[PDB]
Amino acid sequence: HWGYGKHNGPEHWHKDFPIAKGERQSPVDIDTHTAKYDPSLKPLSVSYDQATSLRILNNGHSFQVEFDDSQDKAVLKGGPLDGTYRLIQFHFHWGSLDGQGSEHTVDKKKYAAELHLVHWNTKYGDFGKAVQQPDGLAVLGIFLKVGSAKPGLQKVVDVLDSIKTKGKSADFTNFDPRGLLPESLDYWTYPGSLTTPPLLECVTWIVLKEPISVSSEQVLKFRKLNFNGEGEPEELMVDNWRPAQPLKNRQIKASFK
Ligand SMILES: CCc1cc2c(cc1OS(N)(=O)=O)CC[C@@H]1[C@@H]2CC[C@]2(C)C(=O)CC[C@@H]12
Ligand SMILES: CCc1cc2c(cc1OS(N)(=O)=O)CC[C@@H]1[C@@H]2CC[C@]2(C)C(=O)CC[C@@H]12
Ligand SMILES: [Zn+2]
Numbered sequence: 165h166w167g168y169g170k171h172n173g174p175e176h177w178h179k180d181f182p183i184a185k186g187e188r189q190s191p192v193d194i195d196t197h198t199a200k201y202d203p204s205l206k207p208l209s210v211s212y213d214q215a216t217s218l219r220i221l222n223n224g225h226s227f228q229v230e231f232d233d234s235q236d237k238a239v240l241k242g243g244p245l246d247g248t249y250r251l252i253q254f255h256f257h258w259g260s261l262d263g264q265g266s267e268h269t270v271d272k273k274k275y276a277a278e279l280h281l282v283h284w285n286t287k288y289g290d291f292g293k294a295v296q297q298p299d300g301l302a303v304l305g306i307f308l309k310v311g312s313a314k315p316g317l318q319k320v321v322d323v324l325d326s327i328k329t330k331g332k333s334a335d336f337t338n339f340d341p342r343g344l345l346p347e348s349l350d351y352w353t354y355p356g357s358l359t360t361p362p363l364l365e366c367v368t369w370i371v372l373k374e375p376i377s378v379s380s381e382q383v384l385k386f387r388k389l390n391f392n393g394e395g396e397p398e399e400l401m402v403d404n405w406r407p408a409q410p411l412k413n414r415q416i417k418a419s420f421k
Contacts, residue, residue: 174407177361177363183357183362183365184363186365189357189363189410190268190356190406190409191267191356192354192408192411193269194269194416195416197271199416200418201419202419205243207243208243208349208419209239209240210240210349211239212251212341213238215231215238215340215341215342216237217231217337217339218335218337219333219336220320220336221327221332222327222332223330225404226255226256226401228254229253229339230336231253237251238250238251244353244368247285247286249301250283254344255279255280256278257277257280257404258276258277258387263276265403266405267407270307275307275309276309276310276378277307278305278306278307278405279305279306279308281341283304288300294366295364298366299366300366301367301368302368302369303367304371305371306371307375308378308383309376309377310379310380310383313382314378316340316342316344317378317382318382320339321386324385327389328388328394330393332394344376346374348372348373348374350374350418351371351420352418353370354414354415354417356368359406360406387401
Protein backbone atom coordinates (compact mmCIF):
# COMPACT_ATOMS: atom_id res chain seq x y z
CA HIS A 165 0.00 0.00 0.00
CA TRP A 166 0.97 3.64 -0.41
CA GLY A 167 3.20 5.45 2.04
CA TYR A 168 6.21 7.71 2.15
CA GLY A 169 9.09 5.28 1.52
CA LYS A 170 11.35 4.65 -1.48
CA HIS A 171 9.15 1.94 -2.90
CA ASN A 172 5.71 3.35 -2.09
CA GLY A 173 6.14 7.12 -1.74
CA PRO A 174 4.83 10.17 -3.66
CA GLU A 175 6.57 9.30 -6.95
CA HIS A 176 4.67 5.97 -7.00
CA TRP A 177 1.18 7.21 -6.12
CA HIS A 178 0.08 7.95 -9.71
CA LYS A 179 0.01 4.22 -10.54
CA ASP A 180 -2.92 3.57 -8.17
CA PHE A 181 -4.23 7.17 -8.31
CA PRO A 182 -3.72 8.73 -11.78
CA ILE A 183 -5.17 12.08 -10.63
CA ALA A 184 -1.74 12.49 -8.97
CA LYS A 185 -0.80 14.12 -12.32
CA GLY A 186 -4.01 16.20 -12.55
CA GLU A 187 -4.67 19.88 -13.14
CA ARG A 188 -5.24 21.03 -9.55
CA GLN A 189 -2.93 18.99 -7.30
CA SER A 190 -1.59 19.99 -3.90
CA PRO A 191 0.58 21.08 -2.27
CA VAL A 192 2.19 23.87 -4.32
CA ASP A 193 4.96 26.39 -3.92
CA ILE A 194 3.55 29.81 -3.08
CA ASP A 195 5.48 32.39 -5.12
CA THR A 196 4.74 35.46 -3.01
CA HIS A 197 5.73 37.93 -5.67
CA THR A 198 3.41 36.36 -8.30
CA ALA A 199 0.44 35.92 -5.93
CA LYS A 200 -1.95 38.84 -6.43
CA TYR A 201 -3.99 40.77 -3.92
CA ASP A 202 -7.68 40.10 -4.58
CA PRO A 203 -10.10 42.86 -3.45
CA SER A 204 -13.03 40.50 -4.12
CA LEU A 205 -12.10 38.30 -1.12
CA LYS A 206 -14.70 38.70 1.65
CA PRO A 207 -13.46 38.70 5.24
CA LEU A 208 -12.37 35.25 6.65
CA SER A 209 -14.31 33.86 9.61
CA VAL A 210 -12.93 31.10 11.85
CA SER A 211 -15.54 30.28 14.52
CA TYR A 212 -14.23 27.57 16.85
CA ASP A 213 -15.77 28.59 20.22
CA GLN A 214 -18.12 25.58 20.26
CA ALA A 215 -15.71 23.01 18.84
CA THR A 216 -16.13 19.59 20.49
CA SER A 217 -13.12 17.24 20.18
CA LEU A 218 -13.65 13.50 20.65
CA ARG A 219 -10.65 11.34 19.93
CA ILE A 220 -7.07 11.21 18.78
CA LEU A 221 -6.01 8.47 16.35
CA ASN A 222 -2.74 7.22 14.87
CA ASN A 223 -3.94 6.55 11.33
CA GLY A 224 -0.70 4.94 10.12
CA HIS A 225 0.54 8.01 8.28
CA SER A 226 0.01 10.81 10.78
CA PHE A 227 -2.16 11.46 13.82
CA GLN A 228 -5.50 13.22 13.83
CA VAL A 229 -7.73 14.89 16.37
CA GLU A 230 -11.38 14.35 15.45
CA PHE A 231 -14.38 16.50 16.27
CA ASP A 232 -18.13 16.03 16.63
CA ASP A 233 -19.36 17.43 13.33
CA SER A 234 -23.01 16.30 13.64
CA GLN A 235 -24.04 19.90 14.29
CA ASP A 236 -22.90 23.32 13.10
CA LYS A 237 -20.46 24.04 15.89
CA ALA A 238 -16.97 24.91 14.65
CA VAL A 239 -17.10 26.48 11.17
CA LEU A 240 -15.04 28.28 8.59
CA LYS A 241 -16.66 30.85 6.29
CA GLY A 242 -15.85 33.96 4.25
CA GLY A 243 -12.62 34.56 2.40
CA PRO A 244 -12.88 32.79 -0.96
CA LEU A 245 -15.60 30.48 0.35
CA ASP A 246 -19.25 30.41 -0.59
CA GLY A 247 -21.32 28.95 2.23
CA THR A 248 -20.36 27.23 5.48
CA TYR A 249 -17.69 24.57 6.07
CA ARG A 250 -17.67 22.43 9.26
CA LEU A 251 -14.53 21.33 11.12
CA ILE A 252 -14.14 17.54 11.24
CA GLN A 253 -10.48 16.94 12.16
CA PHE A 254 -6.97 18.28 12.18
CA HIS A 255 -3.70 16.54 11.54
CA PHE A 256 -0.08 17.38 10.84
CA HIS A 257 2.73 16.65 8.43
CA TRP A 258 6.31 16.86 9.66
CA GLY A 259 9.92 16.06 8.96
CA SER A 260 12.81 14.02 10.30
CA LEU A 261 14.74 17.33 10.62
CA ASP A 262 13.62 20.88 11.42
CA GLY A 263 14.47 22.07 7.88
CA GLN A 264 11.72 20.03 6.23
CA GLY A 265 8.24 18.73 6.93
CA SER A 266 5.78 21.18 5.41
CA GLU A 267 3.81 20.34 2.27
CA HIS A 268 3.28 23.89 0.97
CA THR A 269 6.40 25.99 0.57
CA VAL A 270 6.76 29.79 0.45
CA ASP A 271 9.24 31.05 -2.15
CA LYS A 272 10.64 27.47 -1.95
CA LYS A 273 11.05 27.67 1.86
CA LYS A 274 10.12 24.50 3.76
CA TYR A 275 8.84 24.72 7.34
CA ALA A 276 9.32 22.08 10.10
CA ALA A 277 5.68 21.00 9.94
CA GLU A 278 2.26 21.95 8.64
CA LEU A 279 -1.10 21.77 10.43
CA HIS A 280 -4.21 21.02 8.42
CA LEU A 281 -7.66 21.90 9.81
CA VAL A 282 -10.10 20.03 7.61
CA HIS A 283 -13.62 21.35 6.99
CA TRP A 284 -16.47 20.10 4.74
CA ASN A 285 -19.07 22.12 2.83
CA THR A 286 -22.35 21.63 4.67
CA LYS A 287 -24.35 21.88 1.42
CA TYR A 288 -23.19 18.30 0.68
CA GLY A 289 -24.55 16.75 3.88
CA ASP A 290 -21.55 14.77 5.02
CA PHE A 291 -17.86 14.38 4.55
CA GLY A 292 -17.91 11.40 2.19
CA LYS A 293 -20.21 13.20 -0.27
CA ALA A 294 -18.28 16.46 0.08
CA VAL A 295 -14.98 14.89 -1.07
CA GLN A 296 -16.68 14.02 -4.40
CA GLN A 297 -17.24 17.75 -5.17
CA PRO A 298 -14.83 20.37 -6.54
CA ASP A 299 -15.76 22.73 -3.67
CA GLY A 300 -16.31 20.01 -1.05
CA LEU A 301 -13.55 20.81 1.44
CA ALA A 302 -11.75 23.82 2.81
CA VAL A 303 -8.43 23.08 4.44
CA LEU A 304 -6.83 25.76 6.57
CA GLY A 305 -3.07 25.26 6.46
CA ILE A 306 -0.75 26.65 9.13
CA PHE A 307 3.03 26.43 9.05
CA LEU A 308 5.04 25.40 12.14
CA LYS A 309 8.54 26.66 12.78
CA VAL A 310 10.78 25.59 15.65
CA GLY A 311 11.35 28.22 18.33
CA SER A 312 9.24 28.93 21.40
CA ALA A 313 6.74 26.29 22.55
CA LYS A 314 3.09 26.57 21.54
CA PRO A 315 1.29 26.12 24.88
CA GLY A 316 -1.93 25.16 23.10
CA LEU A 317 -0.21 22.20 21.44
CA GLN A 318 1.11 20.54 24.59
CA LYS A 319 -2.04 18.58 25.45
CA VAL A 320 -1.70 16.97 22.02
CA VAL A 321 2.00 16.22 22.48
CA ASP A 322 1.43 14.55 25.85
CA VAL A 323 -1.11 11.99 24.69
CA LEU A 324 1.07 10.76 21.77
CA ASP A 325 2.64 8.09 24.04
CA SER A 326 -0.77 6.43 24.25
CA ILE A 327 -1.15 6.22 20.45
CA LYS A 328 2.36 5.21 19.43
CA THR A 329 1.38 2.70 16.76
CA LYS A 330 -1.01 2.45 13.82
CA GLY A 331 -4.66 2.01 14.75
CA LYS A 332 -4.32 3.09 18.36
CA SER A 333 -6.75 5.72 19.56
CA ALA A 334 -7.45 7.54 22.80
CA ASP A 335 -10.26 9.68 24.16
CA PHE A 336 -9.43 13.35 23.58
CA THR A 337 -12.22 15.61 24.72
CA ASN A 338 -12.35 19.33 25.47
CA PHE A 339 -9.42 20.30 23.29
CA ASP A 340 -9.63 23.89 21.95
CA PRO A 341 -8.14 24.30 18.44
CA ARG A 342 -8.10 28.12 18.82
CA GLY A 343 -4.86 27.57 20.73
CA LEU A 344 -3.18 26.46 17.49
CA LEU A 345 -3.88 29.72 15.52
CA PRO A 346 -1.39 32.54 14.80
CA GLU A 347 -2.32 36.20 15.44
CA SER A 348 -2.95 37.14 11.81
CA LEU A 349 -5.42 35.53 9.43
CA ASP A 350 -3.69 36.97 6.32
CA TYR A 351 -3.70 34.14 3.78
CA TRP A 352 -3.08 32.84 0.29
CA THR A 353 -5.78 30.78 -1.46
CA TYR A 354 -5.96 28.53 -4.50
CA PRO A 355 -7.96 25.53 -5.74
CA GLY A 356 -6.33 22.15 -5.11
CA SER A 357 -6.52 18.59 -3.81
CA LEU A 358 -6.00 16.18 -0.92
CA THR A 359 -2.26 15.74 -0.44
CA THR A 360 -2.49 11.95 0.18
CA PRO A 361 -4.19 9.19 -1.79
CA PRO A 362 -6.85 9.28 -3.09
CA LEU A 363 -5.66 12.82 -4.05
CA LEU A 364 -9.16 14.03 -4.82
CA GLU A 365 -9.46 17.51 -6.37
CA CYS A 366 -12.00 18.76 -3.85
CA VAL A 367 -10.13 21.35 -1.73
CA THR A 368 -10.15 25.13 -1.50
CA TRP A 369 -6.79 25.72 0.17
CA ILE A 370 -6.40 28.62 2.58
CA VAL A 371 -2.79 28.87 3.78
CA LEU A 372 -2.00 31.37 6.52
CA LYS A 373 1.03 33.62 5.99
CA GLU A 374 2.04 33.74 9.66
CA PRO A 375 3.55 30.52 11.04
CA ILE A 376 3.12 29.33 14.62
CA SER A 377 6.19 28.51 16.69
CA VAL A 378 6.54 25.13 18.45
CA SER A 379 9.47 23.95 20.57
CA SER A 380 12.15 21.47 19.53
CA GLU A 381 10.83 19.11 22.26
CA GLN A 382 7.28 19.30 20.93
CA VAL A 383 8.25 18.32 17.37
CA LEU A 384 10.66 15.64 18.69
CA LYS A 385 7.67 13.95 20.26
CA PHE A 386 5.87 13.88 16.86
CA ARG A 387 8.92 11.98 15.56
CA LYS A 388 8.58 9.21 18.20
CA LEU A 389 5.30 8.00 16.72
CA ASN A 390 5.35 4.86 14.56
CA PHE A 391 3.96 4.15 11.08
CA ASN A 392 3.78 0.46 12.03
CA GLY A 393 1.31 -1.42 14.18
CA GLU A 394 2.02 -2.84 17.62
CA GLY A 395 4.32 -5.83 17.63
CA GLU A 396 5.65 -4.98 14.16
CA PRO A 397 9.16 -3.79 13.36
CA GLU A 398 9.47 -0.13 14.38
CA GLU A 399 9.35 2.50 11.64
CA LEU A 400 9.46 6.09 12.92
CA MET A 401 6.65 8.31 11.65
CA VAL A 402 8.65 11.10 10.02
CA ASP A 403 8.67 12.81 6.58
CA ASN A 404 4.99 12.20 5.95
CA TRP A 405 4.76 15.14 3.51
CA ARG A 406 4.13 15.31 -0.24
CA PRO A 407 6.42 17.70 -2.18
CA ALA A 408 5.17 20.71 -4.18
CA GLN A 409 3.30 19.91 -7.38
CA PRO A 410 3.01 21.90 -10.63
CA LEU A 411 0.82 25.02 -10.40
CA LYS A 412 -0.39 24.58 -14.00
CA ASN A 413 -3.32 26.82 -14.89
CA ARG A 414 -3.90 28.33 -11.46
CA GLN A 415 -3.43 31.72 -9.80
CA ILE A 416 -2.72 32.07 -6.12
CA LYS A 417 -4.62 34.98 -4.60
CA ALA A 418 -3.56 36.94 -1.51
CA SER A 419 -5.93 38.41 1.06
CA PHE A 420 -3.45 41.20 1.84
CA LYS A 421 -1.51 43.92 0.05
C1 LIG B 1 -9.69 9.22 2.22
C2 LIG B 1 -11.07 9.68 1.72
C3 LIG B 1 -12.16 9.47 2.78
C4 LIG B 1 -11.82 9.59 4.13
C5 LIG B 1 -12.76 9.40 5.15
C6 LIG B 1 -14.09 9.10 4.82
C7 LIG B 1 -14.42 8.98 3.47
C8 LIG B 1 -13.48 9.15 2.46
O1 LIG B 1 -13.82 9.07 1.14
S1 LIG B 1 -14.10 7.77 0.61
N1 LIG B 1 -14.16 7.88 -1.04
O2 LIG B 1 -15.43 7.29 1.12
O3 LIG B 1 -13.01 6.81 1.00
C9 LIG B 1 -15.22 8.88 5.83
C10 LIG B 1 -14.71 8.96 7.28
C11 LIG B 1 -13.61 10.01 7.41
C12 LIG B 1 -12.37 9.55 6.62
C13 LIG B 1 -11.22 10.55 6.77
C14 LIG B 1 -10.90 10.90 8.24
C15 LIG B 1 -12.19 11.41 8.89
C16 LIG B 1 -12.66 12.71 8.20
C17 LIG B 1 -12.14 11.72 10.39
O4 LIG B 1 -11.22 12.29 10.97
C18 LIG B 1 -13.45 11.27 11.04
C19 LIG B 1 -14.29 10.79 9.83
C20 LIG B 1 -13.21 10.29 8.87
C1 LIG C 1 -9.31 14.21 3.96
C2 LIG C 1 -8.18 15.10 4.50
C3 LIG C 1 -6.93 14.28 4.78
C4 LIG C 1 -7.00 13.25 5.72
C5 LIG C 1 -5.87 12.50 6.03
C6 LIG C 1 -4.66 12.78 5.40
C7 LIG C 1 -4.59 13.82 4.49
C8 LIG C 1 -5.70 14.58 4.21
O1 LIG C 1 -5.61 15.54 3.22
S1 LIG C 1 -5.00 16.78 3.40
N1 LIG C 1 -3.45 16.57 3.74
O2 LIG C 1 -5.75 17.52 4.41
O3 LIG C 1 -5.12 17.45 2.06
C9 LIG C 1 -3.34 12.04 5.64
C10 LIG C 1 -3.57 10.67 6.29
C11 LIG C 1 -5.04 10.26 6.28
C12 LIG C 1 -5.91 11.31 6.99
C13 LIG C 1 -7.35 10.80 7.18
C14 LIG C 1 -7.45 9.36 7.75
C15 LIG C 1 -6.65 8.43 6.84
C16 LIG C 1 -7.23 8.42 5.42
C17 LIG C 1 -6.48 6.97 7.29
O4 LIG C 1 -7.27 6.31 7.96
C18 LIG C 1 -5.14 6.46 6.75
C19 LIG C 1 -4.53 7.73 6.10
C20 LIG C 1 -5.21 8.86 6.88
ZN1 LIG D 1 -2.78 17.12 5.49
